Amino acid sequence: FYFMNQLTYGFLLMITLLILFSQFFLPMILRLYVSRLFISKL
Amino acid sequence: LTTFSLYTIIVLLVITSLYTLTNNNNKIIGSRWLISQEAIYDTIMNMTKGQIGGKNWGLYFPMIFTLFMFIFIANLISMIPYSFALSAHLVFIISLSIVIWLGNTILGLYKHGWVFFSLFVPAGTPLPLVPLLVIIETLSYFARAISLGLRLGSNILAGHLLMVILAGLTFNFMLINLFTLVFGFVPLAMILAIMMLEFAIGIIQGYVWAILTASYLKDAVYLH
Amino acid sequence: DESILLLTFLGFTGLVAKYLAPAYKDFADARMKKVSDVLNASRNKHVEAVKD
Amino acid sequence: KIKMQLLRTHPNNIKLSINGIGKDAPTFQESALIADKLLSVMKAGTYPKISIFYNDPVSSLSFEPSEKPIFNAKTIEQSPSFGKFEIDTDANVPRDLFEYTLANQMLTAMA
Amino acid sequence: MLKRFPTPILKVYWPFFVAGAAVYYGMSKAADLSSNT
Amino acid sequence: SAWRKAGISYAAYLNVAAQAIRSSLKTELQTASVLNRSQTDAFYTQYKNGTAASEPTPI
Amino acid sequence: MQLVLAAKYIGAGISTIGLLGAGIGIAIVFAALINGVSRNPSIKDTVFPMAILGFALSEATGLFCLMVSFLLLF
Amino acid sequence: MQLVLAAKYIGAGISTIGLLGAGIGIAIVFAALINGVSRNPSIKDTVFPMAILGFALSEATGLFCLMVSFLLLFG
Amino acid sequence: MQLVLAAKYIGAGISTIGLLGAGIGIAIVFAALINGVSRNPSIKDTVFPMAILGFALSEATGLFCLMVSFLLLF
Amino acid sequence: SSGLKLQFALPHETLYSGSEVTQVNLPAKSGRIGVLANHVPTVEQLLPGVVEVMEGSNSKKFFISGGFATVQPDSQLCVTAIEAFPLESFSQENIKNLLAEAKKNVSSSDAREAAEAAIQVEVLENLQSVLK
Amino acid sequence: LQSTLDNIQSARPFDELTVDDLTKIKPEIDAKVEEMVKKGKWDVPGYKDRFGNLNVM
């Protein structure tokens, strides 16, 4: 019955997580990497 | 309203609960709740660098992360007993796999056009079996598609249902005569080991998903 | 019925709080002390590079 | 000459003395034959540690007495860098490589 | 909160969204053809 | 065949191989250098703990 | 009609031993893993996930067969 | 209904030798264990926990066999 | 009901041949035991307890199998 | 690197020393092994047989009286043996058979002589492959 | 340089500095991070030597 329900809300969360992780949650850690290496290299 | 859509809400709330409240005020030192996603970042980084090996390899490094974490989180939620099946809907997971495989095909066909079907001749062969290796590659070309989802959720359909039925076994173990209370501990430790294996069928199955689609992205972007 | 599974989960979390959390404590502490050590040592090193 | 040195000061230690060497530059036959005589009558395989003392010409007007150790075959499996090399378990390769090491090290010592 | 970075999601990840739309429309055909069971 | 069990050690095994290849030499090119390689004149005297002696045997 | 549920139950019976391929399979991987670390102790991290990775490849295939039992069980 | 539990009992009979890979499986792991301590004497403290890893969730698969043979017997 | 005890009996028949794998397995254990002690005389009764340990709780599977055969008689 | 560094060594004269090479073929206890550019680090005792050295040029064929092949982990293969051999000149059946029957006669003597006699029997019957 | 030494002695909050303050003291930080995401070189070179990869594999 609820293939549309599970599928549509899952795809909406898929688009949400892709754009979300990409814009926020990966480069917020990459800033930690670049900051640590920029302190260590000076 | 859907309890499964509520489960997706719980997924997004825990994903907020992995970085935001984790980060003690944007500190360099990288505290104990942040070491988790630090190690996850590095074990996906060192994975897909050496997997696809592209000069432009990190461009698909986001998606392999977000295809991992959804499967990594949705197989740490139904581990709690009083829950409903999240990842055990094979329709949804195999639908996701079909989306992934078809996106791989569209990506490679836009990159290569006609020569994307150069994958069907992998290695040198004599003449009379050149198309045969094509055929059961084409027969394996959508077998690449269908099995990948049909693995994992069917694991999870074998996962939690297992912890259903054996619970009923221990429910049908302890309503016969009182001598069932003596040395009736080893089914409890057996279902304990079942949950031990169930964390494996969450975590390592998610990493299996990630590593196989890493190989699939390498084959789809670069021709052999 | 399903309370047996939560009982197994309570025993498992008792084993986790017995066994895993001090090991992850030692692991995170070792990584933390190593990062703080190298991060402080680079600063003291280029302090002495200024002093040179 | 080193026999008449060490027999004068320690006649209890010396158990074998090779004589008849320095008439030519020695070949592999003599050194290999002495390598067989060490493992036929002296039983060097029981010995944990073996050292060869040779005379090392650093240059023409300089010289050197030098120690050169001989690792026995039991030690080779105890080597931290040993399992990198694929060796057989079914061919006794340390049990022969030890004798070959003794052969060429004593040949380098003589020549 | 979290510093927003404009990371390329549309000029990189179009075909998987395209395939998601295609599977949604094929699922429309399926759940209009196989919901009379 | 069981020379490791019955006969020679491995260096001596290849030494007997060396004398066999030098014995099956071409008699045109069996030079004086190869015959120098097979000139065994070393003598061994197994001294004892009391600085005793055996006779010098040609190895 | 009185047979089809009994037939599904014997079908759950015959569909069981396919986890035998699991029972052999993961075995040799750990066997190889011991031979992975016996002759080379300082490479074990290299193979410590890479063995167990294949574990989840084989285990799940064993965990194929009996869930095909279970939906044949129901 | 005179036949269904009988067929369940024979189904539990044929669902019994699926733990065949139990009786081989864990055993041959120990085989390499006896190899691994043989050709490497100072590795035992290394190998036996990992090996008992390769014990436990290698034999529990065989447990699956008899729990099928326990449930189709009873439930 | 005259059929079901006969089915129990032939079920006890088919639930018996699982000792195949235990008999092969403990044999492979002793096989690697002899092959590991012949290449290592110095370490024999350090390993032999762990060998008989793996022997014992490898044969416990076939023990479980024939007691399942006994209760399927019952 | 591509190719291989070969270091062939004899107690009187080392023939090759750091030469770049493509293929070597050499007799070990596990059988006749060919080694190419990279290889597993491996120590192979060398039964007396034939070693063939193929380069960018052709393959030179040697009879060899035994020794050790050793693959240094930077893919540098060294061979440490005793005797060299030309194309075919150094061996003749008149010296082989007439001595070989005497060696088989020595193989029925006392033990130390008979063992070395049997070794020389095996080496001459290996030289029969060079007779080819 | 004496003033830099005196500033260096009293202003090292080395276990509690915020990376937002590092972005505030260097827009080179955000410039390299943003260019690194735009090119996609998610590998940070020169990092693994002094700072461990720390992962499971």
How far apart CA K50 and CA A37 sit, in angstroms, is: 9
Other Cβ atoms within 10 Å of F2 Cβ, number: 8
Q: Which of A28, D60, J120, G63 is nearest to B201 (CA)?
A: G63
Alpha carbon distance I25, G24 (integer Å): 10
Domain count, chain K: 1
Residue B200 contacts G, CB cutoff 8 Å:
yes
β-pairing, F57-58 vs F43-45, is antiparallel
B51 SS3 class: helix
Query: 3-state DSSP call for residue D86?
Result: strand
- Looking at residue B199, its amino acid is F
CA H57-H60-H64 angle, to 5 degrees, is 140
Which residues are paired to J42 by β-bridges? D86
Beta carbons of F33 and D6 less than 8 angstroms apart: no
Residue F35 near chain J (CB below 8 Å):
no
CB atoms closer than 10 angstroms to residue B1: 6
| 3-state DSSP helix/strand/coil % of chain C, to nearest 5 | 95, 0, 5
Q: Determine contact, residues I15/I69, Cβ cutoff 8 Å.
A: yes
> What domains sit in chain H, N to C, each tagged with a CATH number?
2-75 (1.20.20.10)
H-type alpha helices, chain D: 2-9, 28-38, 73-77, 93-110
Rounded Cα distance, B93 and J132, in Å: 67
The span from the CA of K57 to the CA of C3, in Å, is 37
- For residue H61, the number of C-alpha atoms closer than 13 Å in the C-beta half-sphere is 36
Structure tokens given for H72: 């189709």
Q: Is residue G30 a contact partner of residue H49, using CB atoms and an 8 Å limit?
A: no
> Around H2, how many Cα atoms within 13 Å sit in the side-chain half-sphere?
3
Q: What are the φ/ψ torsions at residue J80 (nearest 5 degrees)?
A: -125, 100
Q: Confirm if J44 and J29 have CB atoms less than 8 A apart.
A: yes
CA torsion I28-I30-I31-I35 (nearest 10°) is 140
Euclidean distance between CA atoms J64 and B6, whole angstroms? 78
- Which DSSP letter does residue B19 get? T
B203 touches chain K (CB under 8 A): no
In order of B98, B121, B145, B209, B216, the CA distances from B142 in angstroms are 9, 16, 5, 16, 12
Per-residue H/E/C for I17-65: CCHHHHHHHHHHHHHHHHHHHHCCCCCCCCCHHHHHHHHHHHHHHHHHH
Chains that touch F (3 or more CB pairs under 8 A): D, J
For chain A, domain boundaries: 1-42
Orientation angle between helical segments H44-74 and H4-14, nearest 10 degrees: 160
B144: which residues sit within 8 A by CB, 6+ positions away? B101, B216
- The terminus-to-terminus CA distance of chain E in angstroms comes to 50
Kindly state the tokens that stand for B86. Answer: 């999240």
Q: Compute φ and ψ for F45, nearest 5 degrees.
A: -130, 105
Q: Return the partners of chain I (3 or more C-beta pairs < 8 Å).
A: H
- Chain F interface mutation, best of D7, D8, D27, D106, highest count of F Cβ atoms under 10 Å: D27
**SS in 3 state form for chain J?**
CCCEEEEEECCCCCCCEEEEECEEEEEECCEEEEECCCCCCEEEEECCCEEEEECCCCEEEEECCCEEEEEECCCEEEEEECCCCCCCCCCCHHHHHHHHHHHHHHCCCCHHHHHHHHHHHHHHHHHHHHHC
Contact: chain K with chain G (3+ CB pairs below 8 Å): yes
Q: From CA F26, how far away is CA J130, in angstroms rounded?
A: 14
Q: Measure the CA–CA gap between D55 and G44, rounded to whole angstroms.
A: 45
Q: Which is it for the CA torsion D79, D82, D83, D86, positive or negative?
A: negative
Q: Which two tokens stand for residue D21?
A: 């060497």
Residues H56 and K20: their CA atoms lie apart, in Å, by 49
The contact set of E with B (CB < 8 A) is: 1-2, 7-9, 12-13, 15-20, 22-23, 27
For residue F3, the enclosing domain spans: 1-59
Partner J, chain F 2-21, Cβ-Cβ below 8 Å = 3, 6-8, 10, 13-14, 16-21
Q: Which residues pair with G70 in a beta bridge?
A: none
SS3 category, B27: strand
| Pick from K16, K22, K57: CB nearest B46 | K57
The DSSP line for H3-58 is SHHHHHHHHHHHTSGGGHHHHHHHHHHHHHHHHHHHS-GGGHHHHHHHHHHHHHHH
| Alpha-carbon distances, residue H2 vs B164, G2, I2, J50 (angstroms) | 28, 9, 9, 79
Give the count of alpha carbons within 13 A of B188, CB side only: 18
Residue with tokens 């492959």: J129
Residue B149 to chain A, least CA–CA distance (Å): 14
Specify the length of chain D in residues: 111
Q: Look up residue I7 and give its amino acid.
A: A
Task: Tell whether the torsion through CA atoms of G38, G41, G44 and G47 is positive or negative.
Answer: negative
Give the closest residue to F14 by CA, choosing from C1, B144, J11: J11
DSSP conformational letter for F56: P
Q: What distance in Å separates the CA atoms of residue B94 and residue B146, rounded to the nearest whole number?
A: 7
In 3D space, the residue among B203, B204, B167 whose CA is nearest the CA of residue B76 turns out to be B203
Cα B75 off chain centre by:
9
Resolution (A): 3.8
Token digits of residue J68: 């050790």
For residues B123-157, one letter each, b for 16 or more C-beta atoms within 10 angstroms of the residue's C-beta and e for the rest, the string is eeeeeeeeeeebeeeeeeeeebbebbbebbbbbbb
- Collect all residues with Cβ–Cβ distance below 8 Å to K45 and sequence separation of at least 6: none
Distance from CA of F41 to the nearest CA of J (A): 19
How far is residue E23's CA from residue I3's CA, in Å, rounded to a whole number? 53
Assess contact for D16 and D42: CB atoms under 8 A. yes
Distance, CA of B207 to CA of I48 (rounded, Å)? 38
Is the alpha carbon torsion for B70, B73, B76, B77 positive or negative?
negative
Question: Of F26, B15, D71, nearest to J92 (Cα)?
Answer: F26
Distance CA D47, CA J109 (A): 33
Tell which of F5, F10, F14, F29 to mutate to test the J interface (max J CBs under 10 Å).
F14
Domain containing residue K46: 5-57
Inter-residue contact B210 to B64 (CB < 8 Å): yes
H/E element, D51: strand D49-55
Residue B197 vs residues B158, B171, B192, H59, H64: alpha-carbon distances, Å: 12, 21, 9, 12, 12
- Tokens 């295609």 map to which residue? E22
Report yes or no: H74 and B172 within 8 Å, Cβ to Cβ.
yes
DSSP B83: -
Give the Cα separation of D51 and K26 in Å (integer).
63
> Could you tell me the two tokens for B205?
């199955």
